[PDB]
Amino acid sequence: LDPGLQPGQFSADEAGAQLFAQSYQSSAEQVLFQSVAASWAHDTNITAENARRQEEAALLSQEFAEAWGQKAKELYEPIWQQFTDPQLRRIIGAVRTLGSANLPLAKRQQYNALLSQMSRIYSTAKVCLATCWSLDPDLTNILASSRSYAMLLFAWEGWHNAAGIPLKPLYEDFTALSNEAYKQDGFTDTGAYWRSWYNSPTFEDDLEHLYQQLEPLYLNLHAFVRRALHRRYGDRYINLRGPIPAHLLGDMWAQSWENIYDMVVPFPDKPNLDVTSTMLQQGWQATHMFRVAEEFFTSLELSPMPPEFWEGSMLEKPADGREVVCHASAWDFYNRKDFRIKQCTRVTMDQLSTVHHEMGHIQYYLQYKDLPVSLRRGANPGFHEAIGDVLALSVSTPEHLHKIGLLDRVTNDTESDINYLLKMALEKIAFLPFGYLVDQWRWGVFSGRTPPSRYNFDWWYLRTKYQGICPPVTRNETHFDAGAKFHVPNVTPYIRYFVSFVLQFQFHEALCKEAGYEGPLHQCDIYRSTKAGAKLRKVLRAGSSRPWQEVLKDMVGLDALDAQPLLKYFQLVTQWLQEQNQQNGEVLGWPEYQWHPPLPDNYPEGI
Amino acid sequence: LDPGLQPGQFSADEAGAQLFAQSYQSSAEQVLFQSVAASWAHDTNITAENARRQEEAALLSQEFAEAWGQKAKELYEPIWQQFTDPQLRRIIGAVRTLGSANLPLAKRQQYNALLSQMSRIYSTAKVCLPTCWSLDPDLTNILASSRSYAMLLFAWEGWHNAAGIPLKPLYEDFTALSNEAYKQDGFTDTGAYWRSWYNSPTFEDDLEHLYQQLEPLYLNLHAFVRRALHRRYGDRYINLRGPIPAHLLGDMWAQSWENIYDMVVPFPDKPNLDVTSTMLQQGWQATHMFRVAEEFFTSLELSPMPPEFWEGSMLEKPADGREVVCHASAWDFYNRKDFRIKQCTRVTMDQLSTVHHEMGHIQYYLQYKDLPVSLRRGANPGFHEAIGDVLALSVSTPEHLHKIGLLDRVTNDTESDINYLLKMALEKIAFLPFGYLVDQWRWGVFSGRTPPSRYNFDWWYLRTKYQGICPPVTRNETHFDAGAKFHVPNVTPYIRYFVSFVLQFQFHEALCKEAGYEGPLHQCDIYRSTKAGAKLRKVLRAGSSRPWQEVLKDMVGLDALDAQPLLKYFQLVTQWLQEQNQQNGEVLGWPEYQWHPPLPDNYP
Ligand SMILES: *[C@@H]1O[C@H](CO[C@@H]2O[C@@H](C)[C@@H](O)[C@@H](O)[C@@H]2O)[C@@H](O[C@@H]2O[C@H](CO)[C@@H](O[C@@H]3O[C@H](CO)[C@@H](O)[C@H](O)[C@@H]3O)[C@H](O)[C@H]2NC(C)=O)[C@H](O)[C@H]1NC(C)=O
Ligand SMILES: O=C(NCC(=O)N1[C@@H](c2cccc(O)c2)CC[C@H]1C(=O)O)[C@@H](S)Cc1ccc(O)cc1
Ligand SMILES: O=C(NCC(=O)N1[C@@H](c2cccc(O)c2)CC[C@H]1C(=O)O)[C@@H](S)Cc1ccc(O)cc1
Ligand SMILES: *[C@@H]1O[C@H](CO)[C@@H](O[C@@H]2O[C@H](CO)[C@@H](O)[C@H](O)[C@H]2NC(C)=O)[C@H](O)[C@H]1NC(C)=O
Ligand SMILES: *[C@@H]1O[C@H](CO)[C@@H](O[C@@H]2O[C@H](CO)[C@@H](O)[C@H](O)[C@H]2NC(C)=O)[C@H](O)[C@H]1NC(C)=O
Ligand SMILES: *[C@@H]1O[C@H](CO[C@@H]2O[C@@H](C)[C@@H](O)[C@@H](O)[C@@H]2O)[C@@H](O)[C@H](O)[C@H]1NC(C)=O
Ligand SMILES: *[C@@H]1O[C@H](CO)[C@@H](O)[C@H](O)[C@H]1NC(C)=O
Ligand SMILES: *[C@@H]1O[C@H](CO)[C@@H](O)[C@H](O)[C@H]1NC(C)=O
Ligand SMILES: [Cl-]
Ligand SMILES: [Cl-]
Ligand SMILES: [Mg+2]
Ligand SMILES: [Mg+2]
Ligand SMILES: [Zn+2]
Ligand SMILES: [Zn+2]
């Protein structure tokens, strides 16, 4: 560790802890920058050399965390919990948790190399027929636009096999090292550490109670969609009393169903709410999508994207043959100047929403860039994930799409409302079981309830239990289907997205009220509301300086996650789907839980 | 409720609570008897009228528990936790727990009535062909001795459909009413009350730690047995890397595997350690089996069965066209006089072990009959289930079988040691996953984690997770396969049996040491050891007066459940099974977790 980065001496008291944090800040920024920079160089340009540099930067960060971490524990171990400065205790608590820096050097290197290798495997995996398809864009477009049961099966099986199988031995080793590291910080396992970020003793119970309120909406959406799939694929491939085959919902993970809207839209005579075709016809490109997102932010009197963002960001998949991490992400370099998005942007309506989601991260970074580095995070991780989604809820309204030239015809009638709320349900309600189950799986792995011998057995138990889907080909424990989802090998927690999908409707309700809007919640558009902007800004500028329950109370008037705003938003389609399913004699659920579809005749040769 | 059973006036202090407890347990003695008496009349003669009277008795019991529980909180609710007397603290907290008495009257009627109907459905269900077969003895005998895949399937599917499907709507109603009752006592759900019996903050974690030490033994036994089934039935019906079809292990629930011993016995040249054929050749009957078990108890200077036991017990299935609950059980009438067994006894070796198990209960009853009622229980429920099994461990040794004329003396060689420990593994190790998982299922139902919409989904998840078996025909949520196991509709907790199967080896080691034995633990016979009997008598007389942790430490030197004795008992066959599986290149476990066998051609 360079001497400029090493901790000096401080009194064993709060006024030294305060200078401890200021000195830490000075050094942490440099260490965070070199770490983020090395990660950027690798993720935009996957090479063995760039992985080596990233691993050395990770080792430097561990060295730093150990020195300041053990200094913080040498002096302030019994006094940091009683400091009068609230932000200072949050700063100290972060610095003192060592994580992977608890591992001996040899195990730190093993851990860093596992992360790099898992990232390379996921983001360079390919499905081959000579020619070979990548996940983004090749397989993504197949899952989204093909309606050939056999072609979709080929992409689904090929992807899950290519990505999952080689990751499994690495993921087992990572899990053991991660647990070893956080056990030295006092946590029973890594999942307990991840859950502690929400500072709620009843977190898991709170989430289950939320999901109990939301599940009836999912069950009815599921039964309605299953019926539409049955009319296209037939009784051989769709069981009206069984799980839906996991490759038929428009998405590799069946996590968002927006791409099958054309098959489920109840009133096709109304305006076409999937504006992808109009974007193509009009010649939209990636940079236009980002400029339109930015202008919504500035319409609220939030910050534009700085020059450093436009000069440094990767907004399209490189055409020079480089391998890149294509999963969309937003980057804070912790120098208060450099902020970037990395996205292999495609010209579609759902990608326009993803652009807003990522730019919402950037807006957060810009608003809290002047806080201490330890407080440059969301009030909780679900806050960070919800910011851009909240704006995108306004952007997706038919009225707003008309304003930006993507929907010529504009209607206000009950059929058009049902169409729109059904499309939004395919995006927001269909995701809820998946956003809930992923970390239930990983929590069980981290705790040891799910050993390697049950990785896939327990994954598919949860997939069927919550999503009501089944794998379209047989799987066994050689397969590692959880590994075929970006966040698992890239070790990004997932429960934040279930929290986000609830929270964003709480935010939307509050911002719409602040904007003076007095119509139906799902027709609200906060575009150009500077009052809504100022309320959102107060949240963003707080970072993690205050408990999220208090930040939420100031914003929405409640100190807890609450499903009622989401339920209110969807109320009309919730009632309509329930009526439709009853009239059609649907079975809610999948009581034939053991059913799987047969294989296509002449599979996989027809491909 | 009779005035003489309603509670009197008592001071609000520990001295008054001492008189309170005495007056409670003198009046409880009379109420319990009339409940047990009416249950007995029903289970040995299932009719609507005996159901009516058993329910009248249950309502009266709930009236009694109400009156005395409400008085107990009225007087002592804020002070009893501070009594110096630990036994009195035990009694009062119990009396303060009302259970189904917390229900309003109309719900009490409904709850009492669901129990009667679930019991009738399970014990009268039949499988009819294309004559009708009953579970005991007909289907039991088919599962134990048929080696026809299709016949075993017909019996397995027939039974699970006939019992499970009609029970499901009733079990849902029962679950809801049971949870409503015990929430009023402060339990999050009925499962939490059941678990509270073990007075351990870390019960579930401790069980999981026990199972982690036992699972390698089960996995090796499983893979060895799967290989033997593959040879018999073929690659069509057995997947060497997948779960075993659930009907092929000699038992309707695949819960113990001793009945396929003759298919997996490695050294069939050696003496047949299944002495069933000798029992029949010699003319054994139910009454002989009970007299032989009795004499083991008295050989230890424990009590004989009293005249009331022999006159009142039902030791054979009645042949007078009558319907009975055939599941074996042992009855305490809480009058210090009447103790009985109800068993549809068959002349087989595993039934001789079941006879000892049931007589274990009776011996317990006899040794604590003078205690005040609230203590007339095992230190915990697993203690009660373990007593007879411990003696049966001695009875099953080839040396003891030789003493009682059921085995021509065998040689103390290695092939006979392996043969024996394998047969015992089929009976004891194979049970461990099942004993563990049944109440995992039931706890999730009570907690709400498992709604009716996932009863069968979650049952088969657990059956595959723990036992590594699969249903031999497709199942869906119309089926209620948990309902096809006696203890579910008859609402008898199951974790006691996992506890018992670990505890009995701790008891066995303690008693063998106390007897002076010094050979291998699995060759010990405590027959006629009056010192062993004396140390066991102490446990039985303690009832539930002292915490089971203290009773246990007095007997075995340790205050907690421990798998080491079980591991020591089986050590030699654990090593041998490991070697056999490596030689055959077995995969341990069932990584093809999705696999199910195909149907037989033109079945049924
Ligand atoms: C689409 O249309 C709906 C429905 O409009 C209402 O019903 C129609 C059948 C006609 O009768 C319309 O004249 C009628 O407004 C619109 O929702 C409605 O918006 C208005 C605001 O413009 C709401 O009125 C307000 O209501 C509150 C009480 O909550 C008062 O405090 C306000 O002063 C004001 O009167 C009205 O409640 C609301 N109706 C419903 C059912 O939500 C909607 O605005 C419109 N959308 C677009 C994009 O044009
Ligand atoms: O979350 C991230 N993008 C979005 C995203 O992935 N999702 C969320 C979504 C997707 C699209 C539109 C939305 O309105 C929201 C929900 C689903 C979930 C999903 O797609 O699975 C990056 S910012 C997080 C990261 C990535 C790499 C890292 O190394 C570190 C962090
Ligand atoms: O346990 C009881 N018999 C034995 C028994 O069932 N088993 C235990 C066993 C079976 C055979 C031999 C043994 O060494 C032990 C373990 C499995 C388990 C099983 O067979 O599933 C009555 S005492 C239980 C009851 C009956 C009716 C009631 O109303 C209340 C309780
Ligand atoms: C991707 O990373 C590689 C390194 O892995 C870069 O290759 C270097 O390119 C520079 C040019 O600036 C050369 O001087 C070095 O010799 C190269 N190093 C190696 C090891 O080949 C490459 O430039 C990067 N690509 C992009 C577009 O940034
Ligand atoms: C069967 O033989 C074994 C040894 O082959 C006997 O075990 C020995 O028992 C004596 C005491 O009787 C001990 O001193 C030895 O240490 C034991 N040896 C082993 C290897 O355990 C066993 O007692 C014999 N049992 C019978 C019933 O004959
Ligand atoms: C449940 O199962 C019943 C019994 O048949 C089983 O399911 C059918 C579909 C076949 O696969 C058969 O081999 C199985 O044994 C069916 O009658 C019933 O329709 C099934 N579905 C429901 C909702 O109960
Ligand atoms: C798992 O499935 C694959 C392909 O279906 C197969 O090659 C493999 O043998 C199966 N079993 C195991 C144990 O891997
Ligand atoms: C069985 O019960 C019925 C009605 O309860 C009664 O009439 C009959 O005598 C009983 N049979 C025996 C054998 O006790
Ligand atoms: Cl998170
Ligand atoms: Cl129990
Ligand atoms: Mg799309
Ligand atoms: Mg048996
Ligand atoms: Zn994000
Ligand atoms: Zn018993």
DSSP string, A26-94: HHHHHHHHHHHHHHHHHHTS--HHHHHHHHHHHHHHHHHHHHHHHHHHHHSTTTGGG-S-HHHHHHHHH
**DSSP bridge pairs for A332:** A339
Q: With contacts defined as CB-CB under 8 Å, which chain B residues touch A596?
A: 594
Stated length of chain B: 604
CA distance A469 to chain B (A): 14
- Asked if residue B48 has its Cβ within 6 Å of ligand 8, the reply is no
Amino acid at A384: H
Pocket probe for ligand 3: among B43, B327, B362, the residue whose CB has the most ligand atoms within 8 Å is B327
- Asked if residue A557 has its Cβ within 6 Å of ligand 1, the reply is no
Residue A238, C-beta contacts closer than 8 angstroms, at least 6 positions apart: A226, A229, A230, A244, A245, A597
Return the CA Rg of chain B: 24
* Token pair belonging to B226: 């799967």
* Torsion angle, alpha carbons of B125, B130, B131, B133, to 10: -40
As to burial, measured by CB atoms within 10 angstroms (0-12 exposed, 13-18 middle, 19+ buried), residue A433 is buried
Among candidate residues B591, B604, B598, the one with its CA nearest the CA of residue B474:
B598
Distance in Å from the first CA to the final CA of chain B: 56
Rounded to the nearest 5 degrees, what angle is found at the Cα of A123, between the Cα atoms of A122 and A127? 80
**DSSP bridge pairs for A329:** A342
Smallest CA–CA distance from B593 into chain A, residue: A476
B468 conformational bin, left if phi > 0, alpha if psi -120 to 50, beta if neither = left
Helix (H) or strand (E) holding A395, with range, is helix A381-395
| Alpha helix positions (H), B184-285 | 190-196, 203-233, 261-264, 276-281
Residue nearest to atom 9 of ligand 7 (CA): A478
CA distance B530 to chain A (A): 45
3-state secondary structure of B469: strand
Cα(A342)–Cα(A364) distance, integer angstroms: 16
Cα(A268)–Cα(A270) distance, integer angstroms: 5
Q: Name residue, tokens 């540099």.
A: A53
Cα(A514)–Cα(B309) distance, integer angstroms: 81
**Is-contact A99 A185, C-beta < 8 A?**
yes
**Is-contact B577 B430, C-beta < 8 A?**
no
As to burial, measured by CB atoms within 10 angstroms (0-12 exposed, 13-18 middle, 19+ buried), residue B600 is middle
Cα(B59)–Cα(B105) distance, integer angstroms: 8
Cα(A478)–Cα(B594) distance, integer angstroms: 12
**What's the farthest any 2 CA atoms get from each other in chain A?**
76
Residue nearest to atom 12 of ligand 7 (CA): A478
Note the Cα B239 to chain centre separation in Å. Answer: 31
Cα(A219)–Cα(A225) distance, integer angstroms: 10
Atom of ligand 5 nearest to the CA of B412: 1
Active-site option among A14, A63, A157, A358: A358
Cα(B554)–Cα(B379) distance, integer angstroms: 12
**CA-based torsion, B188, B190, B192, B198: positive or negative:** positive
Packing angle, helices B149-183 and B431-447, rounded to 10:
40
Q: How far is CA A269 from CA A259, A278, A415, in A?
A: 19, 17, 9
Among candidate residues B357, B296, B351, B297, the one with its CA nearest the CA of residue B501:
B357
Q: How far is CA A491 from CA A94, A126, A174, A374, B156, in A?
A: 19, 21, 10, 20, 45
Among candidate residues B471, B489, B376, the one with its CA nearest the CA of residue B117:
B489
**Is-contact B345 B501, C-beta < 8 A?**
no
Parallel, antiparallel or unpaired: strands B244-245 and B469-470:
parallel
* Token pair belonging to B248: 């092929």
**What's the farthest any 2 CA atoms get from each other in chain B?**
76
Among candidate residues A488, A459, A447, the one with its CA nearest the CA of residue A118:
A488
Active-site option among B358, B427, B509, B586: B358
* Token pair belonging to A374: 């330890």
**Is-contact B254 B469, C-beta < 8 A?**
yes
Residue A336 DSSP one-character state: S
Among candidate residues A301, A259, A213, A224, the one with its CA nearest the CA of residue A501:
A213
Q: How far is CA A302 from CA A294, A309, A330, A431, A540, in A?
A: 9, 15, 17, 29, 10
Query: How many Cβ atoms from other residues are within 10 Å of residue B2's Cβ?
Result: 11
Q: Name residue, tokens 């009349």.
A: B41
Measured from the alpha carbon of residue A312, the closest ligand is 4
Return the CA Rg of chain A: 24
A487 is catalytic: yes
Helix (H) or strand (E) holding A581, with range, is helix A564-583
**Is-contact B271 B408, C-beta < 8 A?**
yes
- Phi, psi at residue A581, to the nearest 5°? -65, -40
Q: How far is CA A486 from CA A444, A604, B275, in A?
A: 18, 26, 60
**Is-contact A367 A306, C-beta < 8 A?**
no
**DSSP bridge pairs for B150:** none
3-state helix, strand, coil in chain A (%, to 5): 60, 5, 35
Q: With contacts defined as CB-CB under 8 Å, which chain B residues touch A457?
A: 464-465, 593
Cα(B221)–Cα(B241) distance, integer angstroms: 14
Cα(B276)–Cα(A571) distance, integer angstroms: 68
| Alpha helix positions (H), A429-561 | 432-447, 455-462, 495-514, 530-542, 548-556
Helix (H) or strand (E) holding B245, with range, is strand B244-245
Cα(B74)–Cα(A362) distance, integer angstroms: 63
Q: With contacts defined as CB-CB under 8 Å, which chain B residues touch A241?
A: 476
Query: How many Cβ atoms from other residues are within 10 Å of residue A337's Cβ?
Result: 11
Active-site option among B288, B402, B487, B596: B487
* Torsion angle, alpha carbons of A180, A182, A186, A190, to 10: -100
Distance B478 CA to ligand 6 centre (A): 8
Domain boundaries defined on chain A: 1-96, 203-275+377-583
Question: Is B357 annotated as ligand-binding?
Answer: yes
* Token pair belonging to A255: 């996590």
Packing angle, helices B48-76 and B86-95, rounded to 10:
120
As to burial, measured by CB atoms within 10 angstroms (0-12 exposed, 13-18 middle, 19+ buried), residue B305 is buried
Among candidate residues B294, B285, B252, B263, the one with its CA nearest the CA of residue B483:
B252
- Give the residue from B215, B222, B436, B457 with the most A CB atoms within 10 Å of its CB, the best one to mutate: B457
Stated length of chain A: 607
**Is-contact B446 B175, C-beta < 8 A?**
yes
Among candidate residues A52, A128, A136, the one with its CA nearest the CA of residue A323:
A136
Note the Cα B80 to chain centre separation in Å. Answer: 34
Residue B555, C-beta contacts closer than 8 angstroms, at least 6 positions apart: B507, B510, B535, B536, B538, B539
Amino acid at A523: Q
* Token pair belonging to B545: 């007066």
A358 is catalytic: yes
Note the Cα A27 to chain centre separation in Å. Answer: 30
Residue A78, C-beta contacts closer than 8 angstroms, at least 6 positions apart: none
**CA-based torsion, B322, B326, B328, B331: positive or negative:** negative
Helix (H) or strand (E) holding B340, with range, is strand B339-342
Residues with CB under 5 A from ligand 11 (ion): A 259, 348, 350
Cα(B189)–Cα(B99) distance, integer angstroms: 11
**Is-contact B383 B503, C-beta < 8 A?**
yes
Residue A102 DSSP one-character state: G
Distance in Å from the first CA to the final CA of chain A: 55
Residue nearest to atom 23 of ligand 1 (CA): A519
**Is-contact B442 B492, C-beta < 8 A?**
no
